[PDB]
Protein backbone atom coordinates (compact mmCIF):
# COMPACT_ATOMS: atom_id res chain seq x y z
CA UNK A 1 0.00 0.00 0.00
CA UNK A 2 3.08 2.26 0.19
CA UNK A 3 5.43 1.08 -2.56
CA UNK A 4 5.83 3.70 -5.25
CA UNK A 5 7.38 5.41 -2.24
CA UNK A 6 10.95 6.49 -2.69
CA UNK A 7 13.51 8.68 -0.88
CA UNK A 8 13.18 11.19 -3.72
CA UNK A 9 9.58 11.75 -2.58
CA UNK A 10 10.82 13.60 0.50
CA UNK A 11 12.92 16.73 0.88
CA UNK A 12 15.30 16.88 3.85
CA UNK A 13 14.64 19.78 6.22
CA UNK A 14 17.01 19.06 9.12
CA UNK A 15 18.14 16.44 11.63
CA UNK A 16 15.81 15.76 14.55
CA UNK A 17 18.08 13.38 16.41
CA UNK A 18 20.80 10.74 16.33
CA UNK A 19 19.35 7.37 17.22
CA UNK A 20 21.38 4.32 18.16
CA UNK A 21 19.49 2.37 15.51
CA UNK A 22 19.84 5.17 12.97
CA UNK A 23 19.52 8.86 12.11
CA UNK A 24 16.16 10.67 12.10
CA UNK A 25 15.36 13.69 9.92
CA UNK A 26 12.47 16.10 9.54
CA UNK A 27 11.18 15.70 5.98
CA UNK A 28 8.44 17.12 3.79
CA UNK A 29 6.69 14.82 1.35
CA UNK A 30 6.85 16.23 -2.19
CA UNK A 31 4.35 13.92 -3.86
CA UNK A 32 0.54 13.65 -3.75
CA UNK A 33 -1.79 13.00 -2.13
CA UNK A 34 -0.05 14.34 0.97
CA UNK A 35 2.34 16.80 -0.66
CA UNK A 36 3.54 19.39 1.81
CA UNK A 37 2.97 17.11 4.83
CA UNK A 38 5.78 16.94 7.41
CA UNK A 39 7.08 13.59 8.67
CA UNK A 40 10.01 12.15 10.61
CA UNK A 41 12.23 9.88 8.52
CA UNK A 42 14.26 7.22 10.31
CA UNK A 43 17.13 5.78 8.23
CA UNK A 44 18.52 2.34 9.11
CA UNK A 45 21.86 1.12 7.70
CA UNK A 46 20.82 -2.44 8.52
CA UNK A 47 17.88 -4.28 6.97
CA UNK A 48 14.59 -6.09 7.27
CA UNK A 49 11.03 -5.48 6.14
CA UNK A 50 8.02 -7.62 6.67
CA UNK A 51 4.31 -7.42 6.32
CA UNK A 52 9.51 -5.94 16.19
CA UNK A 53 6.25 -4.40 15.07
CA UNK A 54 6.90 -0.81 14.02
CA UNK A 55 3.36 -0.48 12.69
CA UNK A 56 1.15 0.11 15.73
CA UNK A 57 -2.27 1.77 15.52
CA UNK A 58 -3.01 3.63 18.76
CA UNK A 59 -3.59 7.28 19.80
CA UNK A 60 -0.52 7.28 22.05
CA UNK A 61 1.98 5.45 19.83
CA UNK A 62 3.86 7.03 16.91
CA UNK A 63 2.28 5.89 13.62
CA UNK A 64 4.16 4.50 10.61
CA UNK A 65 3.01 6.00 7.30
CA UNK A 66 5.51 4.57 4.81
CA UNK A 67 8.21 1.92 4.70
CA UNK A 68 10.52 1.29 1.77
CA UNK A 69 13.96 -0.26 1.45
CA UNK A 70 15.94 1.60 -1.20
CA UNK A 71 19.60 0.76 -1.80
CA UNK A 72 20.41 -1.35 1.24
CA UNK A 73 19.11 0.98 3.94
CA UNK A 74 15.51 0.96 5.18
CA UNK A 75 13.49 4.19 5.34
CA UNK A 76 10.67 4.54 7.89
CA UNK A 77 8.29 7.49 7.58
CA UNK A 78 6.67 8.24 10.94
CA UNK A 79 4.51 10.94 12.49
CA UNK A 80 6.39 14.17 13.12
CA UNK A 81 5.78 15.16 16.77
CA UNK A 82 6.19 18.95 17.00
CA UNK A 83 6.54 19.21 20.78
CA UNK A 84 9.80 17.27 21.05
CA UNK A 85 10.47 14.87 23.93
CA UNK A 86 9.70 14.90 27.66
CA UNK A 87 13.38 14.83 28.64
CA UNK A 88 13.89 18.28 27.14
CA UNK A 89 10.84 19.65 28.94
CA UNK A 90 11.80 17.97 32.25
CA UNK A 91 15.29 19.48 31.99
CA UNK A 92 13.85 22.96 31.60
CA UNK A 93 11.07 22.58 34.22
CA UNK A 94 13.23 20.53 36.66
CA UNK A 95 10.11 18.63 37.80
CA UNK A 96 6.40 18.45 36.95
CA UNK A 97 3.37 18.94 39.18
CA UNK A 98 1.39 15.80 40.08
CA UNK A 99 -1.37 17.07 37.80
CA UNK A 100 1.01 17.10 34.83
CA UNK A 101 2.58 13.78 35.81
CA UNK A 102 -0.83 12.08 36.21
CA UNK A 103 -1.86 13.09 32.66
CA UNK A 104 1.38 11.98 30.97
CA UNK A 105 1.45 8.73 32.95
CA UNK A 106 -2.23 7.98 32.29
CA UNK A 107 -1.78 8.36 28.51
CA UNK A 108 1.44 6.33 28.70
CA UNK A 109 -0.34 3.59 30.68
CA UNK A 110 -2.71 3.07 27.73
CA UNK A 111 0.07 3.20 25.17
CA UNK A 112 2.17 0.70 27.11
CA UNK A 113 -0.67 -1.72 27.80
CA UNK A 114 -1.53 -1.69 24.11
CA UNK A 115 2.02 -2.60 23.10
CA UNK A 116 1.90 -5.30 25.78
CA UNK A 117 -1.27 -6.74 24.23
CA UNK A 118 0.61 -7.08 20.94
CA UNK A 119 3.28 -9.01 22.81
CA UNK A 120 5.72 -6.10 22.71
CA UNK A 121 8.03 -5.18 25.60
CA UNK A 122 8.87 -1.45 25.59
CA UNK A 123 12.49 -1.99 26.65
CA UNK A 124 13.52 1.66 26.27
CA UNK A 125 11.02 3.48 28.48
CA UNK A 126 12.36 6.88 29.61
CA UNK A 127 11.48 10.56 29.07
CA UNK A 128 13.80 10.83 26.04
CA UNK A 129 11.60 8.40 24.12
CA UNK A 130 8.27 10.01 24.85
CA UNK A 131 7.31 12.73 22.36
CA UNK A 132 4.65 15.46 22.54
CA UNK A 133 2.42 16.47 19.63
CA UNK A 134 1.30 20.04 18.94
CA UNK A 135 -1.63 19.72 21.38
CA UNK A 136 0.53 18.42 24.21
CA UNK A 137 -0.52 14.77 24.09
CA UNK A 138 2.20 12.13 24.22
CA UNK A 139 3.33 9.49 21.76
CA UNK A 140 5.66 6.59 22.58
CA UNK A 141 8.47 6.08 20.09
CA UNK A 142 11.50 3.80 19.53
CA UNK A 143 9.69 0.55 20.38
CA UNK A 144 9.07 -2.86 18.85
CA UNK A 145 11.55 -5.53 19.98
CA UNK A 146 9.79 -8.51 21.54
CA UNK A 147 12.53 -11.15 21.55
CA UNK A 148 15.43 -9.58 23.45
CA UNK A 149 20.38 0.77 27.69
CA UNK A 150 19.98 3.45 30.36
CA UNK A 151 20.93 1.67 33.59
CA UNK A 152 18.93 4.01 35.88
CA UNK A 153 15.70 2.73 34.32
CA UNK A 154 16.53 -1.00 34.45
CA UNK A 155 14.30 -3.23 36.53
CA UNK A 156 16.06 -5.53 39.05
CA UNK A 157 15.37 -8.73 37.06
CA UNK A 158 16.96 -7.07 34.03
CA UNK A 159 20.04 -6.02 35.97
CA UNK A 160 20.34 -9.58 37.28
CA UNK A 161 19.58 -11.07 33.83
CA UNK A 162 16.93 -13.21 35.52
CA UNK A 163 14.24 -12.40 32.96
CA UNK A 164 12.47 -9.58 31.17
CA UNK A 165 8.69 -9.65 30.85
CA UNK A 166 6.33 -6.70 30.49
CA UNK A 167 6.66 -6.37 34.26
CA UNK A 168 10.06 -4.74 33.74
CA UNK A 169 8.27 -1.98 31.82
CA UNK A 170 6.08 -1.17 34.82
CA UNK A 171 9.18 -0.77 37.00
CA UNK A 172 10.65 1.59 34.39
CA UNK A 173 7.25 3.34 34.38
CA UNK A 174 7.76 3.84 38.11
CA UNK A 175 11.23 5.30 37.54
CA UNK A 176 9.72 7.74 34.97
CA UNK A 177 7.07 8.82 37.52
CA UNK A 178 9.69 9.37 40.24
CA UNK A 179 12.00 11.32 37.91
CA UNK A 180 9.19 13.54 36.60
CA UNK A 181 7.89 14.15 40.12
CA UNK A 182 11.23 14.86 41.80
CA UNK A 183 13.62 15.87 39.05
CA UNK A 184 15.94 13.07 40.19
CA UNK A 185 16.38 9.30 39.78
CA UNK A 186 15.38 6.87 42.57
CA UNK A 187 18.47 4.70 42.15
CA UNK A 188 21.76 6.21 41.02
CA UNK A 189 25.33 5.64 42.12
CA UNK A 190 28.64 7.17 41.04
CA UNK A 191 28.98 4.68 38.20
CA UNK A 192 27.11 2.01 36.26
CA UNK A 193 28.11 -0.75 38.69
CA UNK A 194 27.03 1.05 41.83
CA UNK A 195 23.75 2.09 40.19
CA UNK A 196 22.98 -1.55 39.37
CA UNK A 197 23.74 -2.60 42.94
CA UNK A 198 21.50 0.19 44.28
CA UNK A 199 18.68 -1.00 42.02
CA UNK A 200 19.10 -4.56 43.37
CA UNK A 201 18.76 -3.43 46.99
CA UNK A 202 15.77 -1.30 45.99
CA UNK A 203 16.07 0.78 49.18
CA UNK A 204 14.11 3.96 48.44
CA UNK A 205 13.56 7.12 50.44
CA UNK A 206 10.31 8.89 49.61
CA UNK A 207 10.64 12.65 49.19
CA UNK A 208 8.18 14.15 51.69
CA UNK A 209 6.54 16.53 49.23
CA UNK A 210 4.91 13.66 47.30
CA UNK A 211 1.18 13.04 47.83
CA UNK A 212 0.22 9.92 49.77
CA UNK A 213 -1.35 8.58 46.56
CA UNK A 214 1.81 9.18 44.52
CA UNK A 215 3.87 7.49 47.23
CA UNK A 216 1.75 4.34 47.43
CA UNK A 217 1.74 3.95 43.63
CA UNK A 218 5.54 4.23 43.54
CA UNK A 219 5.90 1.69 46.35
CA UNK A 220 3.59 -0.72 44.49
CA UNK A 221 5.63 -0.35 41.29
CA UNK A 222 9.03 -0.66 42.93
CA UNK A 223 8.63 -4.28 43.99
CA UNK A 224 11.90 -6.14 43.37
CA UNK A 225 10.02 -9.35 42.60
CA UNK A 226 8.20 -9.04 39.23
CA UNK A 227 5.46 -11.32 40.58
CA UNK A 228 4.46 -8.86 43.31
CA UNK A 229 4.90 -5.68 41.27
CA UNK A 230 1.79 -3.68 40.39
CA UNK A 231 0.73 -4.53 36.85
CA UNK A 232 1.54 -8.24 37.10
CA UNK A 233 -2.02 -9.43 36.57
CA UNK A 234 -4.38 -10.90 37.04
CA UNK A 235 -6.25 -7.76 35.96
CA UNK A 236 -3.07 -6.51 34.28
CA UNK A 237 -2.74 -2.80 33.54
CA UNK A 238 -6.21 -2.34 35.04
CA UNK A 239 -4.86 -2.74 38.58
CA UNK A 240 -2.53 0.16 37.89
CA UNK A 241 -5.29 2.16 36.17
CA UNK A 242 -7.63 1.57 39.13
CA UNK A 243 -5.02 2.86 41.56
CA UNK A 244 -6.19 5.73 43.71
CA UNK A 245 -3.51 7.87 42.04
CA UNK A 246 -5.60 8.11 38.87
CA UNK A 247 -9.02 8.40 40.56
CA UNK A 248 -9.77 11.63 38.67
CA UNK A 249 -8.99 10.08 35.29
CA UNK A 250 -11.65 9.14 32.73
CA UNK A 251 -9.78 6.59 30.64
CA UNK A 252 -12.47 6.69 27.97
CA UNK A 253 -12.13 10.39 27.17
CA UNK A 254 -8.38 10.15 27.71
CA UNK A 255 -8.18 7.49 24.99
CA UNK A 256 -10.22 9.85 22.82
CA UNK A 257 -7.77 12.66 23.55
CA UNK A 258 -10.67 14.60 25.05
CA UNK A 259 -8.73 15.60 28.18
CA UNK A 260 -6.75 18.77 27.55
CA UNK A 261 -2.97 18.57 28.08
CA UNK A 262 -1.42 20.61 30.92
CA UNK A 263 1.38 21.90 28.71
CA UNK A 264 0.75 23.41 25.28
CA UNK A 265 3.72 23.16 22.85
Curated annotation (Swiss-Prot):
Residues covered by the Protein kinase domain: 10-246
Superkingdom field: Eukaryota
Which catalytic residues are annotated?
A: 124 (proton acceptor)
- Give the subcellular location: Nucleus; Cytoplasm
Task: Tell me how the protein is altered or processed after translation.
Answer: N-terminal myristoylation results in an activated kinase in the absence of added growth factors.
Q: Which residues does the record list as Phosphoserine (modified residue)?
A: 2, 232
* Entry binding sites for ATP: 16-24, 42
What does the annotation say about its assembly with partners? Answer: Forms a complex with either MAPK1/ERK2 or MAPK3/ERK1 in quiescent cells. Transiently dissociates following mitogenic stimulation. Interacts with ETV1/ER81 and FGFR1.
Its function, per the record, reads: Serine/threonine-protein kinase that acts downstream of ERK (MAPK1/ERK2 and MAPK3/ERK1) signaling and mediates mitogenic and stress-induced activation of the transcription factors CREB1, ETV1/ER81 and NR4A1/NUR77, regulates translation through RPS6 and EIF4B phosphorylation, and mediates cellular proliferation, survival, and differentiation by modulating mTOR signaling and repressing pro-apoptotic function of BAD and DAPK1. In fibroblast, is required for EGF-stimulated phosphorylation of CREB1, which results in the subsequent transcriptional activation of several immediate-early genes.
Instruction: Please report which protein family the annotation says this sequence is part of.
Output: Belongs to the protein kinase superfamily. AGC Ser/Thr protein kinase family. S6 kinase subfamily.
Q: What is the designated name of this protein? A: Ribosomal protein S6 kinase alpha-1
The organism of origin for this protein: Homo sapiens (Human)
| Designated gene of the protein | RPS6KA1
Amino acid sequence: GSEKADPSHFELLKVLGQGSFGKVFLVRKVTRPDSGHLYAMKVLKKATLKVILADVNHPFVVKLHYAFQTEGKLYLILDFLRGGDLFTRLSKEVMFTEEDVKFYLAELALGLDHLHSLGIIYRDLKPENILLDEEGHIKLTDFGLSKEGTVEYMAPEVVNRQGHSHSADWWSYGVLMFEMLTGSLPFQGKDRKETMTLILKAKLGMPQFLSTEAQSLLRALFKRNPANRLGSGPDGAEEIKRHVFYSTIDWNKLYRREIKPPFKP
